[PDB]
């Protein structure tokens, strides 16, 4: 009761420091494996940072949805911060898009002056990338249905909406792995191959992050964590998943509808 | 509150003995100054 302001109070935590050290171990493992072919430090880095990010968010869920310090002004700031992270990732991706556009708008002389460079056979965008767009757009409209069913208050329908959007996202990920197994060349093969393989796999890293966020929000909703209006976890999930929808749409139209 | 507050004591380094504190600043900032010296002597050994 000594705290008079309605803002947030933090008991000091070790977990920012341990997450920072885990990132340091991650990058040390990256250089140790990229130069001296050792995997032990890299596996240590993955174990450290994944566990640390787990109990960091486990602490924030404890201190938010059972203790109750998350004032409406606090999730107002949380949606500020999530919007800031979203637009930072917009400009991250847009830097990647503009790198692709600089590579593709002016084809260099060794590529034959044509996009794509000759001699390679990029996959047709006609069937399975339309499948990718269909499955991701269906997942997005399903999670909008999930948000409106949060508004309505129908638990089993929220359950099926989440189950179908995780099913769709995992189907997306396993199939894009399948045509990674079913593509004519590799990331080390040319400027065009390198850019779309890196961009699409990097989007794949974001969509597995988004799918794991959907896993964890499902297991919260099974534990009756989210309520009628204080549902910012699913708001962040919806914003991130609509983000990866529109980013996938941009890289789709660019890579596939442009020069194929 | 439960943590003591005031001038000087809200620093990571203890303040009350000024000769020892001077020893702390000399070793700290001297190691900071002598670090790139140690880099450059390290490649001059290594080259």
């Amino acid at each position: 009761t000594h705290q008079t302001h309605a803002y947030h109070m933090v008991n000091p935590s070790p977990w920012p420091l341990t997450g920072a050290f885990s990132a340091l171990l991650l990058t040390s493992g990256l250089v140790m494996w990229f130069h001296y072919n050792s995997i032990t430090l890299l596996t240590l880095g993955l174990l450290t940072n994944i566990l640390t990010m787990y109990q960091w968010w486990r602490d924030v869920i404890r201190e938010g949805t059972y203790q109750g310090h998350h004032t409406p002004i606090v999730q107002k700031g949380l949606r500020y911060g999530m919007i800031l992270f979203i637009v930072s990732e917009v400009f991250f991706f847009a830097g990647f898009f503009w790198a692709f556009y600089h590579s593709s708008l002016v084809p260099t002389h060794d590529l034959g002056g044509c996009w794509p460079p000759t001699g390679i056979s990029p996959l047709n965008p006609l069937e399975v990338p339309l499948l990718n767009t269909s499955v991701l757009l269906a997942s997005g409209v399903s999670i909008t249905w999930a948000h409106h069913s949060l508004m309505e208050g129908k638990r089993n329908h929220m359950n099926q909406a989440l189950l179908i959007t995780i099913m769709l996202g995992l189907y997306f990920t396993i199939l894009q792995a399948s045509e990674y197994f079913e593509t004519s060349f590799s990331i080390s093969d040319g400027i065009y191959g390198s850019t779309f393989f890196m961009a699409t796999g990097f989007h794949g890293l974001h969509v597995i992050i988004g799918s794991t966020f959907l896993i964890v929000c499902l297991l919260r909703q099974l534990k009756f964590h989210f309520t009628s209006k204080h549902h910012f976890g699913f708001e962040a999930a919806a914003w991130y998943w609509h983000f990866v929808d529109v980013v996938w749409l941009f890289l789709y139209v660019s890579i596939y509808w442009w020069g194929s | 509150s439960h943590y003591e507050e005031g001038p000087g004591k809200n620093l990571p380094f203890s303040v009350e003995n000024k000769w020892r504190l001077l020893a702390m600043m000399t070793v700290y900032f001297g190691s900071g100054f002598a670090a790139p010296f140690f880099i450059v002597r390290h490649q001059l050994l290594k080259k």
């Binding site: 529109v246 749409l249 139209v253 442009w258 | -």
Partner: protein
Amino acid sequence: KFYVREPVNAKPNWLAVGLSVGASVFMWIYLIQTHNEDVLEYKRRNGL
């Protein structure tokens, strides 16, 4: 809250805004592209 009823245009329709901006930029890219290959077809068919 000023109005006694919530207006239908109180909050912007973000799906509509995104669709509008995306359609506009897609049509701009498509238009400049078709201008470029029409120019290239012109020169390659008439030897310029």
